[PDB]
Structure formats: C-alpha cells, structure tokens
Automatic annotation (TrEMBL), chain B:
Chlorophyll a binds at W7, C12, N19, H61. It comes from Chroomonas placoidea. This is Photosystem I reaction center subunit PsaK. Its main location: membrane. The gene is psaK. Keywords: Membrane, Photosynthesis, Photosystem I, Plastid, Thylakoid, Transmembrane, Transmembrane helix.
UniProtKB/TrEMBL annotation, chain C:
It catalyses: reduced [plastocyanin] + hnu + oxidized [2Fe-2S]-[ferredoxin] = oxidized [plastocyanin] + reduced [2Fe-2S]-[ferredoxin]. This is Photosystem I P700 chlorophyll a apoprotein A1. The gene is psaA. [4Fe-4S] cluster binds at C564, C573. It comes from Chroomonas placoidea. GO terms for molecular function: 4 iron, 4 sulfur cluster binding; chlorophyll binding; electron transfer activity; magnesium ion binding; oxidoreductase activity.
From TrEMBL, chain D:
It comes from Chroomonas placoidea. It is found in: Cellular thylakoid membrane; Membrane. Chlorophyll a 18 binds at H7. Chlorophyll a 20 binds at H14. The PsaA/B heterodimer binds the P700 chlorophyll special pair and subsequent electron acceptors. PSI consists of a core antenna complex that captures photons, and an electron transfer chain that converts photonic excitation into a charge separation. The eukaryotic PSI reaction center is composed of at least 11 subunits. Chlorophyll a 19 binds at H6. The chain crosses the membrane at residues 3-25, 61-74. This is Photosystem I P700 chlorophyll a apoprotein A2. [4Fe-4S] cluster binds at C45, C54. The gene is psaB. Belongs to the PsaA/PsaB family.
TrEMBL record, chain F:
One of its GO terms (cellular component) is photosystem I. The lineage of its organism: Eukaryota, Cryptophyceae, Pyrenomonadales, Chroomonadaceae, Chroomonas. GO terms for biological process: photosynthesis. Belongs to the PsaJ family. Keywords: Membrane, Photosynthesis, Photosystem I, Plastid, Thylakoid, Transmembrane, Transmembrane helix. Its main location: membrane. It is found in: Cellular thylakoid membrane; Membrane. The chain crosses the membrane at residues 12-34. The keyword Flavoprotein does not apply. Gene3D superfamilies: Single helix bin (1.20.5.510). It is a single-pass membrane protein. May help in the organization of the PsaE and PsaF subunits. This is Photosystem I reaction center subunit IX. The keyword Plastid applies.
Amino acid sequence: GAGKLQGEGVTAIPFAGRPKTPAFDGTWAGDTGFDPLTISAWLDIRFLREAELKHCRVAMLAAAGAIAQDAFTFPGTVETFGTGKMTALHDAAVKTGTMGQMLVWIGFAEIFSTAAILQWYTDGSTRKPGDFGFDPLGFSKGKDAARLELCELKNGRLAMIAIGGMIHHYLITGKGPLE
Amino acid sequence: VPQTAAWSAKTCSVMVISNLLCIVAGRYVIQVKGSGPSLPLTGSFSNFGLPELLATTSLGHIVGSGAILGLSYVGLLS
Amino acid sequence: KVSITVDKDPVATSFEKWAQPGHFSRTLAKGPKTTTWIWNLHADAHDFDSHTSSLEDISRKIFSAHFGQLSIIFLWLSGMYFHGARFSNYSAWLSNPTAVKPSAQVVWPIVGQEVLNGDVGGGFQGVQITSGFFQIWRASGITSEVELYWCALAGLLMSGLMIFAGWFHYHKAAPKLEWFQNAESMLNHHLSGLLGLGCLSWAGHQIHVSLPINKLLDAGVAPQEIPLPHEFLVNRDLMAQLYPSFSKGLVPFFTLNWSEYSDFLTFKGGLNPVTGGLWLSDTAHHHLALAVLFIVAGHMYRTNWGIGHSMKEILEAHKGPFTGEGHKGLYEVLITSWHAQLSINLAMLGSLSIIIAHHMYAMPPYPYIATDYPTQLSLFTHHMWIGGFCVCGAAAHAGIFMVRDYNPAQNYNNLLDRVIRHRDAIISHLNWICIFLGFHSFGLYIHNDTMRALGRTQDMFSDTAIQLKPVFAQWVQNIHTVAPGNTTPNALATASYAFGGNVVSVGNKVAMMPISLGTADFMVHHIHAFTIHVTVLILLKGVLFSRNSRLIPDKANLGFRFPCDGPGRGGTCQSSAWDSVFLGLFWMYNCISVVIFHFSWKMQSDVWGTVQADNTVTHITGGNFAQSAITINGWLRDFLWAQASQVIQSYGSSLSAYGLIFLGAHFIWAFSLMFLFSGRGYWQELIESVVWAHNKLNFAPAIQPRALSITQGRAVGLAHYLLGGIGTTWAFFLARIISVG
Amino acid sequence: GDFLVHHAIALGLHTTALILVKGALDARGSKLMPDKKDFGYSFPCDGPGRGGTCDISAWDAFYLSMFWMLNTIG
Amino acid sequence: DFSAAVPFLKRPSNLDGTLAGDVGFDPLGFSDVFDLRVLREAELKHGRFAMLAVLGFLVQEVYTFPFFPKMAPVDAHDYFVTQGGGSQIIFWISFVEIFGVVALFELIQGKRDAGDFAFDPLGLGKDEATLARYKVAEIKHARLAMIAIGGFIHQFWVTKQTVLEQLG
Amino acid sequence: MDSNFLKYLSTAPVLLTVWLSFTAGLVIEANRFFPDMLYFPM
Ligand code: CLA
Ligand code: CLA
Ligand code: CLA
Ligand SMILES: CC1=C(C#C/C(C)=C/C=C/C(C)=C/C=C/C=C(C)/C=C/C=C(C)/C=C/C2=C(C)CCCC2(C)C)C(C)(C)C[C@H](O)C1
Ligand SMILES: CC1=C(C#C/C(C)=C/C=C/C(C)=C/C=C/C=C(C)/C=C/C=C(C)/C=C/C2=C(C)CCCC2(C)C)C(C)(C)C[C@H](O)C1
Ligand SMILES: CC1=C(C/C=C(\C)CCC[C@H](C)CCC[C@H](C)CCCC(C)C)C(=O)c2ccccc2C1=O
Ligand code: SF4
C-alpha cells in the first residue's frame, strides 16, 4: 500500500489527470488514477469495488482452474464428463448436473452477498467492499496486509484479461490454456 | 419479407457514423447537464459527461439500427 | 433530485381503531345518534381527502389501498386458476375444443340446484363459463391441471406479497410526499420497466413456450404427447425443428440480421385457419415491438442525469393566441390533486376498455375463442360496461377536483379558466347538437315505424327504399380489405376479416366473416353518436357548473355532493356535479345497452352461423337485421321478443339459473323506481308512524331511525336501476347465446 | 293461482290505501312539518333543512298512490 | 455490530443473543417485521415435529406394529390417509393445537416463553445450568432434524429406498 | 385475544354476517338431511 504504486499522485492518463470522485481520494486500494469514463462519479465506489473484487476472485479462480484442468484431471471425471476441454467441459458438466449443483450453491452464497450489499443502504452497514472475514490462516493480521490487498487486486485484474484470452484461444484453436 | 444483411464493414460503418452523429447532435441539443465530472476532453467536448455519452450512444444505436434496416429494405446497404 | 425518502413506523398496527368506526372522520368519531351515521360511515370510508388535510397522509393511504386492491386481484386470479385445475374440464376441452363447452364451476346438490350442473361435455357436468380462461391458458401453452395448480400457487403468493407490501408501506416504511410527486420518474419507470419489460417477458414466454406448444396442438399432437416448456427451453434442436431459425442463435439479433427470425417473428395478419384466432407468431412480434417502443418511450423524462424533458416546461411552452396562458399550472394541478389524475386515468382506462372490446372481437386473439360465441358476446359487453362506468367515474372525479382542489389564483387565464369562462357556449352548442342528433337519429326510426304501420313501405329509410348508406365506413372497409400487399406490403392478410375477405370457419362454424354496413347500420351508428353526445352533455355540464352558475353563484361552498339548495329560485333540485354524474350514469346505461344490443343482433344475424357443405353460411337469425333493425317494432319483436324465448323457456334446464336471474333483475330494476320516483318526507313520516308503533310497546332503538338522505336515496335508486337492467341483459344474453352456441 | 293473485290484489289495495290514508291523516301535520296545513295541500317541499323534506305533501302522497293504483289495477 | 454467525452481515437488531441458539443469523430480516417470540415458537414447533419425524422414520423402518401392514414410512402416509388412522392423528394434533392457539395468544401478551409449555414429566431440567445447556441442545437438534427429515424424505423419493437400506 | 379485536368482532356487521351464515348453514343442513319437506309430517 505505497503512495507511489497506488494512492494520490498516480495518474494512468496524464493528459486527463486523476478524477475527482470519492473513489480517488487515495484511500481505495488499486488506485492508478484510471477512470477515463468517470463511472465512479455516478455509481457508488463501494458497489464498484465489490463488483471488481467479485470479478477478480471469480476470474482468478477460473484461470487457475483452466490451468489445473489442462495439467491434471481428477480421477473419475475424465471418464464421466467425457474428454471435452474448457467450455465443452462446461457443457458436459451441465449435462452431468455438476454445474447445476454448483449454480444452486453459488446462488445460496450470493443471496447472503446480496444481503451484505443491501445492508450498505438499508441499515447503513460499515462493511468494507469485498470483505467477508475469510482470513483463516493469518496474513491480513500483519505488516504485509495492505501489500496483500494490492496484490489481490492486481492479480485479479491480470486474471480477468488472462481468462478472456484463454477462452478465446480455446474457441479458435480448440486447445486449452497450456498450448 | 424485407432483407436484413449479415454483419459487414458496411453495417459497422453505419453504426459508428450514427453514433458519432448522435454524439455531436447531443452536444448541440442536450439542454440540461447532470451534476458531476466530465469525461477527460477539452474544447467543445468540455462538459461531456458519462450520462450524456450514454444517452447519445443509445440514440446512435437506435438510429443505426433504423438506418441499417431501412437501407437493407431499399437494397442500398445489401 | 429524484430520491427515496420514507417515514419509519408512522402508524402503529393495532386493533384499537377497528373497534372505533368512524375514527377517520371527526364528525363520525362521536357516534351514531341516528341511522344516517351508519350510511355516512360507508359513504365517507374512502374519501381520504375529507379525513385530513395532509397530502402526504392521503398519498400513503392511496398507495396502501392500491396494494390491497392488487392483493385482491391476485386472489381472484389464483381462484380462477385453481378452479380451472380442480373443478374444470380443461383437459377434455384441450382434447376436443370444438365439442365440449368450457366449464370451471360446479354446484352442490342441496335444493335441486344440481340441475345447474349441465352436460357441458367431456364426461364433465358443471356451469358453463364465458370468461375465456380456457383459451387464455391454451394460448399460454398450459396443457395440464398441474400447471394450473402452480399458477394458482403463484397467484396466492403474489396476493400475500401485495397485502404484506400494503401493510409495510403504511405502518413500517411510508414514502413521503416528495417521493410521491415524481411524475417524470414514475412515468419513466412505468413505461420502460412495467409495460416494456412486461411485454418483453411475454414475448419471451410466447417465443419459448406458447409458440411451439400451440404449433404442435394445431398440428394435432396430443397435449400429453407435447414436450414440456423447459424441454423446449433447453433443447434448441427440438425448437429448431419447429422454428428452424433457432439454430442460428442470437447472432442475427445482435448483428441486426433480423430477417433470420421471420419463421417465428412474422407480419402475417388474418387468423390462424385451425384455431380461428390470431397467429401467436404475430402476437410475439407485436409484443416484442411494443417492448422496444415502451422502453424507448420511458427514456423521455428528466430524473437525475440532466438528459430528458420536464413536463412543466413542455406544458408551459405549449400556448397559443386562442388559449392565453395555455397549459400553465396543469403540472402543479396534476402533482397536487389525486382527483384530477383519477379523472384522467379513469377516462383513458374506460376508453381503452371499449377499444379492447371492439378489437378483441374483430381480431379474436386467443385460439378457439372466435367460435366460442358465448365468450365473445360476454367479453364484448362486459368490457363495454366497464368502459362506460370508468368514463362516468372520470366525470365524477373531474367534478370533485373542480369543487375541492381547484384554485383560481393558480389557474388564471389558462385553459381551465378559459373553459370555465366560456362554459355557456360549450353547453349550449352541445345541447343543440344533442337535440339535432336525437331528432335525426330516432325520428328516423319513428318515421319508419309510422310508414310501415301505414303501409307506405316505399317511403321508409331502408335499403329497399330511401337509402342512408354509410359510404364513409364502406370506403374505410374497402381500404382495409385492399391494404394487404398495397399499403401494408409485407402483410399477407387483412388485420380483420370484418372489413372484408373470406370467411374463417373453425369446426364448421364461422369464426369471423365480413360485416356489411347498410341503412340499419347507419341509423344505429348515429344513435350511438346521439347517446354518447347526450351522456357527455350531462357529465360536462355538471363538471363545468360544479362551482357556480347563474342559478347558484356559490355552489363550491355547498360542495360537490349536496341534495339541493332549497325550493327557492323555482327549485334547485339535483343542481350539484354529483347529480350530474347520477343522470349521466343513467344515460351511460342507455348508451351501452343500445351498443351491446346492436352487437348481439348484428353478429347473430350477419356474422355468426354454421357453414354448410355448399360453403354457404346460415346465420343464427338469418339476415333479420337488415330489414327489421330499421324500426322500433322490429327491435321489439325480432330481437327482444324473439330472442327472449331462450331465457324464458330455461326452466328445468341448466339455464334455469339464467331464467331466475332474469326475473330477479326485473324485480330489482322495478324496485329502484321506488327510490327514484319518491322523496324523503313521505318515508320519514311513515317511519314516524312505525316508531310510534314501536314506542307503544315501550321500546325503540337508541339510534333513531331516519329515512335515507336525498343523495343516498338517489344513489340507492341508481344502483338498483343499474343492477336490475344490467342483470336482465346479462341473463338474456347468456341464456340466448349458450342455447344457440 | 287464483289464490295467489288474489293475495297480490289484497297487497295492492292495502298499499294504495296505506299511501292515501297516510297522506290524508298527515296532511295537517307530522313530526317533520307540524304546520303543514299552513302550507296547504300541494306545496313542493320544506327544503333540505331537517334532513330533507322531499315529497312531504298530501299531494305527493296522491302522486305515489297513483303509481300504486296503476300497479294494482294492472 | 456484525453477526457472530456471518461476519460480513450486520447483527439483526432484534437478535440480541438472549435466546438459545442465537448466533445473529437473520439475513432476510424476518425478525425486523415479525415478533421474534412468535417466530421462535414456530421454530421450536417445527423442530420438535421434525425430530419426532426422524425418530419415527428410523423406528418404523426397523420395526412396525404387528397389527399394521409393513411398509416404508412415506408410503404409510398414503395408506393411513385411506385407512383412517391418519385422520385420527390429524384430529388429535388439531385438538392439542386448539390449546396451542391459547398458548400463542398468551405468548403474544407476554405471559409465556416461546416454546415453553411447562412439559418436564421426568424433571430433567430442574437446575439452571443444565436447563440452559439443554435449551441450546434442543434448538441445535431441532434445526439439525429439520434439515435431516427433508433429507430423508427427498432421498426416499429419489432412490425409493429407506435410509437404513440406502446407507449400505 | 386483544379486547379491541374482540370489540371489532362484536361490531354489528360482523355479528350479522356470522349469525346469518350460521342460520343459512342450519337451514342448508336441515334441507340436506331432511329434503323436500313441504309439510310437517303427521
Ligand atoms: C437513411 C436511413 C433510413 C432508411 C433508408 C429507412 C427506410 C425505411 N424505414 Mg426507417 N428508420 C431510420 C432510418 C431509415 N429508414 C431511422 C434512423 C430510424 C430510427 C428512428 C428508423 C425507424 C424506422 C421504423 C420504426 C420503421 C422504419 C421503416 C422503414 C421502411 C418503411 C417505412 C414506410 O414506408 O412507412 C410508411 C408508412 C406509413 C406512411 C404509415 C404510417 C402510419 C402509422 C402506421 C401510424 C402513425 C399514426 C399516428 C399515431 C398519427 C398521425 C399523426 C397525427 C398527429 C395526425 C423504410 C424502407 C418501417 C419498416 O421497416 O417497415 C417494414 C418501420 O416500421 N424505420
Ligand atoms: C373489474 C373489472 C374487470 C374484470 C372483472 C375483468 C375481467 C376479465 N378481463 Mg379484463 N380488463 C378490465 C377490467 C376487468 N376485466 C379493464 C379495465 C381493462 C382495460 C385495461 C381490461 C382489459 C382486458 C384485456 C385486454 C383482457 C381482459 C380479459 C379479461 C377476462 C380474463 C381475466 C384475466 O385474467 O385476463 C388476463 C388478461 C390478459 C391475459 C391480457 C392482458 C393484456 C393487457 C393489454 C395488459 C395491460 C396491462 C397494463 C398494466 C394495464 C394498464 C394500461 C395503461 C397504463 C394504458 C375477464 C372476463 C382477457 C380476455 O378477455 O380473455 C379472453 C383479456 O385478454 N381484460
Ligand atoms: C379507480 C377507481 C376509482 C377510485 C379510486 C375512486 C375513489 C373514490 N370515489 Mg369513485 N368512482 C369511480 C371509480 C373510482 N372512484 C367510478 C368508476 C365512478 C362512476 C360510477 C365513481 C363515481 C364516484 C362518485 C359519484 C363519487 C365517488 C367518490 C369516491 C371517493 C369515495 C368513495 C367511497 O367512499 O367509496 C366507499 C365504497 C362504497 C360506498 C361502496 C359502493 C358500492 C355500491 C353500493 C355498489 C356495489 C355493488 C356491487 C358491485 C355488488 C352488486 C351485486 C349485488 C347482487 C350485491 C373516492 C376518492 C365520492 C366522493 O369523492 O365524494 C366526495 C363520490 O361522491 N366516486
Ligand atoms: C462457458 C461457456 C462459454 C464461455 C465463456 C467464457 C468463460 C467467456 C469469457 C470471456 C472473457 C473472460 C472475455 C474477456 C475479454 C477481455 C477483454 C476483451 C479485455 C480487453 C482489455 C482491454 C481492451 C484493455 C485496454 C487497456 C486497459 C483497460 C488497461 C491497460 C492498457 C490497455 C490494455 C490498452 C461460451 C461462451 C463459449 C459458451 C459455452 O456454451 C459456455
Ligand atoms: C409431499 C408429501 C409428504 C411430505 C413431506 C414432507 C414432510 C416434506 C418435507 C420437506 C422438507 C423438510 C424439506 C427440507 C428442506 C431443507 C433444506 C433444503 C435445508 C437447507 C439448509 C441449508 C442450505 C443450510 C445451510 C447452513 C446454514 C444456512 C447455516 C450454517 C451453514 C450451512 C450448512 C451452509 C409426505 C411424506 C407426507 C408424502 C405425501 O405424499 C405428501
Ligand atoms: C323506500 C325508501 C326509503 C325507506 C327505506 C329505508 C329507510 C331503507 C332502510 C333499509 C334497511 C335498514 C336495510 C337493511 C335491510 C335490507 C333488506 C338489506 C340490504 C341492504 C344492505 C345491502 C345495505 C327512504 O328512506 C327514501 C329516502 C329518500 C328517497 C327515497 C326513499 C325510498 O324510496
Ligand atoms: S328538497 Fe327534495 S324537492 Fe325540495 S328541493 Fe331538495 S330535492 Fe328538490
């Protein structure tokens, strides 16, 4: 959480300059002064950061999963689902019903996510955006705490574009991430 | 039944030109501006805000769809 | 700024006030010294504007009342769906829609009323229904009682949600007047969200559920053999068999290659030859186009982001040399008075109901509804009546606004003020036009009656004599007949075959055929114009003279609803805007009765019938209308006397209920005349004598009995009059049509 | 059938007599207008004062009895 | 505040932890608009029904009365509906629930504790410490059995197999 | 039960509706079990 890497004074687009929205006070992490369209002036920065971290997590876990699926396939799946990779595997698991159960349980979790988001406006909750308290093995309770927030945001941003590229490469070539 | 051509450079050009025309026309015609910052542009486009961009692009898409469908109908685009 | 602001826990939910009738009103909270208090309680129950001066309180009450009404409507719908699931022959009707009469009500065998469980068909005996629910469900793609049970469950859940929402938004989180007074935001959201998304969702449902199921049903597949809607949703190949364009996907949609969807999104027109209703593939495209139109329309007004309009600016900008200030002040009037909004909305809703009746018969939208003649007649007349009542209510609430919420200070030299300032010209001209129309529309019938009774049949106004041809209507019909391919090039058939074309026949029975207009049609149309104009005269005269007149310069002080201003000035009976609504309701009854009679006779005589193997159609009455509908004797004999046989010979049959209701409605109609022809003094004196009789036995109520107020007597007379007349027509129509169809 | 229609006729006679007798006996006065004889036989009303006084005259009693007499003879 | 059960969800205002098994779980805020005592009575009635239902399922699978036909617990329902025993059980449950209505009204009036019917025939809850421990255990078992009975019934519907026979 | 709710049940229209529904049920059941009684049996 350095004021040179992130925070006030950093400008991604020099010809524009850092926006004047609440999101760019220098307190919000992952701040590179990047908001050409000025979306943070019209949507709550809390909502936007919650969405960004959800995207980061989901795309940071899908990319790792694509790599894992291409390297090692769990026993009993390479037969049940078939031998389709990536999105073909998604279709096969949908037929199996695996994806349906995944959707049901993820929706169960996202219901409580919806409650958490609503409590910002209904009951004025002070939760941090993207903060769920999931720190079982202690890393946030220490010196590398803000450095781990920046790493999370940066790796999620990397992973979103990486997974987009991987999916499109599979759609074109038909190969998995490792090619 | 009318003809609707498949996606092509002509369709893309019509859509893009419609969007640009509606953006400029929005700059000239939109009376009241919202209360907020502006997209980082100078000169005539110095009060261009997001909501105004979004509105101009929505009208540009309406106009582009209309023009594409009509030009396909009359056979000019296709 | 358009924002949400509510008051938390404004009213505590408690039964304390349930035991204090009249709590809402200061005059009534005291108690019932007389029986007039009992009637005042009900008369003022929902007049929130007379309970308090707080617009915030009135708006909150209205919001919660709307939630309660929605819960009631959802309960009604759930009941209809549950009855379709449990006490109906819907499956048999699906198997053979043209042979078994729809039925979803069964009576208990108590006093011999089990006779009403007639042999409707499909091994089922119950009460034949004429609401069209079976056709609605068939169009929706329902093919089981399980789906109807789930529909009933959804309706019940929505009713519970609505009642909870009403309670919550009155007692837990009541929005404020700033929230309520968002016309721009409230119209943007209604237009885009409510309407646009509703028709978009319905288009999706029709494309994914209704279209393939109805395709197979028309192809003759059994309802049990047809796959399930989720099967259609998830098997794009199965749907790609019926509509081969689903193999293309949504790429055509997002690339504007919309012609790829012509298989299930088509501008075809006409009627489905198998079902006799509109093409569901046409309805899907209709609703998709409507969704686009509404979502675009809902982006017109300014809410929070600068883009949009302000209705205040538009109205204030629209003014001309004949109107002075123009529409200035109307925005404030409409965001400060609920009664003005209610009047506008009621007028529009009633006119919409009338338009819906017309369009729903000439273009039967549901499968197998056109040949279900009882359903068509019942729906047409029902929606006509709803429209008339809504229009009269619009007049009533315009008068209420004029008396209560009209302020000359804020309305100076605007359109409202100028209308008031030249009201005499309007009413005089409307009076003259009403007299002229009455003469030249009814004196024509009288002339025909006199000539026919004198034997001068060549001097009548008939197609075989002096002719009054509706050339303009015939010209419009010709235009619409020739439009397909010429002025609507990409439409295969006419919008309605009523304009002209070929007969559509389902089950050897006419679904819709051209409707020819002649002298009788000219006469009846001009009589419709006469009745509408007189109704408008009454209502508009009352509304304009609600506040003051040459007779009573101070009438707003008397109020919107007062009996009179005394026997002075020659007599000032029924001078208020309430009594105008009373008389205009009488005249609306007249108008709608003539309209529905015209529909019944014309459709039974020139449209409906059975088509023989020759291709010739024999109608229910067989051309009676052209030569009989030109005389009042013709209407009395060939329509009333002739067609009342079914209802008067219904005893011992499943229509015996219709016969009994015929008689009871006659009874109530006559019973109304006791209140309408009479006055309060006679009944108060009779009550004095009866109270003497009671006192002679050392007992009498503490709540002194009183005769009904003058206004209440008029209201009771009108209510019984309307109930009796409409019930008579109800029994007559249903018995006749269910007997001959 | 004769029995029932005869009792209908009895109802009609009795109700016409009711209206006419009430009009005749209350013509001079009632609790509502205890000074009716001052106003006469066929005055219009006494106004909306005491809850409404429409058709408070013996002439109005006759006017209603004429509907009932037309009903009975019918 | 934040609920103990869900760190990222605010503790519901009505749920102050006084009641047994209160870990601050009420994401949808039923306690905000409805009486927590009435909700607790509903919870404990449901849980008691579910626990007795689980025990009934197991005991019916292992043993059935000599005078009743042997059958799966779920099929026993439809059988007894026609036989008439189900009618008797429903009638007597309704008879007890008539007094349950009076108990609920007293609970609303604040005379009774939700789920407290003063039913300790064997006097197992005389000492407080044990009573509170038992109340926590009761609510925990109630919730667990509410889940487990649904699991049993749905698994039987899927496999058409009693739970004991399925577990092998 | 709330005394106010009981008073609301005691209100005239509620009592009239309940009493007349009870009477209608009485007559209906009498006609259901002893139908077509045009006379007192003697
Ligand atoms: C250069 C570009 C271009 C071109 C070549 C075309 C060409 C065409 N457009 Mg158009 N269109 C364009 C741009 C273009 N469009 C744009 C920018 C838009 C977006 C706004 C549209 C939106 C649009 C729509 C929404 C539709 C078309 C349609 C059409 C085609 C048929 C129109 C016709 O003949 O109707 C002639 C029709 C009439 C003369 C009858 C009009 C009467 C209607 C039915 C009722 C209106 C009455 C009104 C309520 C009351 C009157 C006013 C009152 C105050 C007195 C035509 C080939 C139509 C089409 O494709 O049809 C198949 C169509 O539906 N266009
Ligand atoms: C209390 C009055 C009343 C009653 C008892 C009924 C009774 C009936 N109506 Mg309804 N109706 C009424 C008022 C009433 N209507 C009014 C005032 C209107 C004008 C808006 C309509 C418009 C209407 C239509 C268009 C249809 C019915 C139908 C029916 C029948 C089936 C019921 C049903 O579930 O339809 C369910 C209704 C539908 C499936 C069609 C809905 C389509 C409309 C256009 C939706 C509009 C919604 C929108 C939010 C309304 C506000 C518009 C405004 C902002 C401009 C039934 C006889 C249906 C029928 O005749 O079936 C054979 C039918 O199609 N009615
Ligand atoms: C959207 C619809 C709507 C709404 C919200 C309102 C709202 C209002 N109207 Mg109404 N009104 C409407 C439509 C509507 N009206 C229509 C369609 C008409 C034309 C008939 C009128 C005509 C009208 C007049 C003339 C007056 C009102 C008044 C009022 C106010 C008080 C009404 C009251 O206390 O009723 C409480 C409810 C009742 C008294 C019950 C009345 C029902 C009668 C007895 C008939 C019911 C018969 C029923 C269908 C069953 C028949 C079958 C039989 C076998 C039993 C209130 C603001 C009054 C006002 O503002 O005065 C200052 C007023 O004088 N309205
Ligand atoms: C599972 C499944 C499927 C699927 C699927 C999936 C999972 C699809 C996933 C698609 C994804 C993740 C797409 C990502 C695209 C990212 C882009 C274009 C980034 C652009 C960045 C730019 C332009 C940056 C610009 C700039 C920025 C901002 C910052 C730095 C400077 C610069 C880089 C210049 C299907 C569809 C195959 C169907 C199948 O039946 C089921
Ligand atoms: C139909 C019918 C019958 C019947 C019947 C009967 C009795 C049907 C009974 C059905 C029942 C009891 C269903 C229960 C479902 C429970 C669920 C889904 C719990 C989910 C809990 C979760 C996700 C907890 C999550 C947990 C939470 C929240 C917090 C802690 C962590 C976590 C683990 C995540 C018969 C048998 C009479 C037959 C007759 O023919 C008619
Ligand atoms: C008959 C009559 C009476 C006498 C009628 C009275 C007092 C009505 C009292 C009837 C009782 C109290 C109603 C209850 C009994 C009914 C059989 C039930 C139906 C009514 C409810 C649905 C409201 C008037 O007071 C009156 C006043 C002004 C103009 C015309 C008339 C008028 O015609
Ligand atoms: S009291 Fe009766 S009669 Fe006299 S004025 Fe008023 S309404 Fe006319």
